[PDB]
């Protein structure tokens, strides 16, 4: 039902993102890697292959705790820094989430998610209203985690909310380990998207202005 | 099932509030306006007519995201300021919510709701315990929004929790637009009341002292 | 050549914006006002009719110093405050500017405009790159100007850059009259859009990634 | 289904804790008190008998709003202070919660609970991941409540998360009555455990590393 | 006598740790590296092979000054950062130390160790009491040492005390070289474990509550 | 017309820079790489090959928005840090710009360029007067971007203005992403050089002292 595939091709990166919000299986009929963080345990299949290993782990923890099936492919330039291949892999990952739920009606529209990870604590609220907005206040006192440049972790969530047309407030409340502090943000966003995209029932677009 | 009508008549305002917490249709057999923010889309009907237009919009966003059907009619004095017609239209709107749920049993009793609106972020918790309390910390750096006097927006929620016999903590966490900051508070309260008045199941009054 | 008409219809406002970036004449074949800030001096015709008079004057000064022909018709709710009829009349005014220039190629792409107005000084830079962004730092120490609520003046430029897919930095450098301070911002944006949408020549999309 | 009994016997205290997470009835076939806060209203039976009366009331409010059936029997030394009989009655109460849910799979894994009590406001998040952690920031400006020594209230929740192998962040946001401030923390933890131990469905261990 | 082998297998790392607290020789009958910091000088054999070279050097200096024989084999994911292969190689290294001394009786139970390294000075106290605790206050003003991410150095000792069920206070008193500051912490812990696990004599469990 | 080739050969780096300020095609008759950021779209050809990938991207964005055709070949020592191959490389790129415009007459002589990039804002002014000067105030709170050492980004523009005999003030006004903050500086310099080297007309050396 809620499936989409997005092939975003620019002169910096080549993207192919297939998503399924309700879970289940996924494949790719024609991949972009030559010769055709991976969890495939019979309910959801999530297999992310970007050039950045720590940014694979954040999309993986996002889709594991959202109930998503998600295949991410990215052939990006890594002789240059990791900005152009994290910003572009967040724009196309917001578009795949946007096309997978067309009609915003019959949903809760408001998800809030707290998630801890071992003294770090992050909340994420999400709004699903067609104006994009992103208030990402991860206070990270590190310059690079393993390959992510640690200022792209807010910039990923900035472009995710931008291209998915959602309003997003992610704020890490405490923590002093920045693997812990950044993974808890993606685990908190996974709780909020799961709560906002939910069967409200009664089949009504949840807005005053009637347009979502 | 959960319906109530409250006709509050004083020498300052005349009120008639009909509410339905489970949604559905509503009408008035004998209105107070002469010759007999309006959403009527087949699941819930919410039609608020106070003399204040911005206070219409806050009760509307409250009832739209609560699943309520709600008709509000307030004939109040507006040659004087808007205090006497916002305080009185919040006392009677807490009484209509109170009479619509008589027995507080089989409910979650604890609703917490975060709701953003475009860089503003408000949380609201609600308690449904028969002592009234209201801790409303909307930090509004404006004097009037469109017709509300912007200090009545906490005073509305003060008298709502007062006359509905609930404990309420509404706190705007961030934001620098006070339409955004005050509407997100009413959208957050709508999530919390929806979560506290919920089918817990097992038919038990959720209290240590056994009285709610 | 560079003309567009946008009819944005929601349950709060009804909009009809016809724009011509190269100037010249404009009309409307079927208007939204019943029975069919106005400058019509033989080179460009600019006629803005919103319910807010001071927001008419800011779109007028924007289109007068941009070389635009622009007709704006907004039927919005004014018994509620002026947010819903200024935000919506900025989203549709960014969409009309976006559809009027389809191919961003052969343009300067970078406009910077300083404009004074009688001790106020505002600069505006504009980027014409398909990610929207808005950094609007008008320091206004007023609550309402004549009918605008003076926090909507940054919120107008926020939604203009949002729906037009441009990056925008507007910053008032000095000034202590907020009519002067806000009009100089719209006069500075008019210089920047005029400078960014300009005949660069040589017919090339001005980007590293080749996509604009 | 989710039942466990823990008999923890040391030279300071003797403990016997029988728990049922899904509610229902409970008894003890051979008690530790001589000759064989009590709620027994036909859905859940919660009967706590420690030597500390205020620590009875906090385990009672924890199990009342969690849906638990819980019998606590602690024979501890009270001629010495109340540390050794509150720390030990929290270690065994985390072990009884741990043995009552063996397989952490098919659960939400992330519960967040806000709960007010009459100007006090506490949130509690819980993680159900097999590393124990406890960040308890109840700001209590009292030395003893009725018999608890008011620094054991964080030390109880420290040893509860320690022996139950969960990660826990309990933080009182406001309040100036420390009965209110400490009871709202246990009422907030009751919402979070109820939300984390919940039927997620689809029968999958919710972790990246696959081990919970 | 005091030997243990721990094979910890998760979907992130595969661990095999063989320890001997009294020294002597050690081998592995079936290793995890393909085709079958190393000191093997006739009294103790210590051979650590993790993917991190600086974390090899800290376990090596820990076991060299403890009298241990210790073989560490960790096959961990290093395309992601080094957190998951340092946290997991500290949990299994606390479990191997825990299983190597079963009965905590006849031991000093309290080891304190100061160790300098060239203007750095660290103390470490250790408690061997079955509640785990870790207060690690290495003040490191570096982000990465050679491959360790320099916030994992406290996180290693956190999970070591966690899984070994010991209470641990490691605090660097001075120093301005963070190789020196972190190696002196592991050399100080080696003095403390050597002092706590020591032949007290008289064969008695050293506790008031009689249970260790 | 405005073409130059500079082959700078030292014992640290070997450079070959061919430039064309008016655009058009460029080739190299005898390259320095064995066996003979690249944009070649029919108007200008820009192909930079230094050992640093992020410094390729900054010369590329400089020449893309200047109208330049530019081939850069730098064979530099990278077992040592990147200073000697970014400085050396900046000196020869100022000399190639200097030899490409011999007679400074008939030009505007004063270019100012603002350029944003996604909350970063940089201005650059340029003077084309034969005393070199460089006031570069990029406030970068990072140590390395991808391969550039992030203090060489001002040191590149220092040596560019030094060897090109121009006066240069580059100042980033805001921004909190240092890829954004440093790329906007090179995009702002591209606007300023384009504006200073411009057909003023009337064929006069624009100076009081008559010598440029
Ligand atoms: O958020 P909505 O669309 O449900 C109705 C809002 O009132 C529209 N809005 C946009 N800014 C402030 N309000
Ligand atoms: O809130 P309840 O009624 O469930 C039981 C409370 O303990 C009563 N109370 C009122 N103030 C402090 N406690
Ligand atoms: O701005 P562009 O598209 O010309 C190339 C940029 O490098 C892309 N980008 C986006 N963020 C940082 N860089
Ligand atoms: O929390 P998990 O087990 O779901 C996967 C985590 O990434 C493991 N971890 C432990 N510290 C940081 N991460
Ligand atoms: O540490 P022990 O077990 O020797 C006896 C302690 O008194 C127990 N305890 C735990 N917290 C405070 N005391
Ligand atoms: O800048 P010029 O050469 O046009 C004339 C200047 O006055 C020369 N100068 C150099 N320092 C101060 N003035
Ligand atoms: Mn970017
Ligand atoms: Mn992780
Ligand atoms: Mn009042
Ligand atoms: Mn509104
Ligand atoms: Mn708005
Ligand atoms: Mn004016
Ligand atoms: Mn204790
Ligand atoms: Mn109480
Ligand atoms: Mn960890
Ligand atoms: Mn060393
Ligand atoms: Mn130098
Ligand atoms: Mn870039």
UniProtKB/Swiss-Prot annotation, chains A, B, C, D, E, F:
Record's keyword annotation contains Metal-binding: yes
Impact reported for residue 6 to I: In strain: CLIB 219
PROSITE patterns linked: IGP_DEHYDRATASE_1, IGP_DEHYDRATASE_2
Binding locations of Mn(2+) 2: 83, 87, 155, 180
Keywords: Amino-acid biosynthesis, Histidine biosynthesis, Lyase, Manganese, Metal-binding
GO molecular function, one term: imidazoleglycerol-phosphate dehydratase activity
Hydrolase recorded as keyword: no
Family: Belongs to the imidazoleglycerol-phosphate dehydratase family.
Note, other: Present with 2100 molecules/cell in log phase SD medium.
Protein name: Imidazoleglycerol-phosphate dehydratase
Organism: Saccharomyces cerevisiae (strain ATCC 204508 / S288c) (Baker's yeast)
Record lineage: Eukaryota, Fungi, Dikarya, Ascomycota, Saccharomycotina
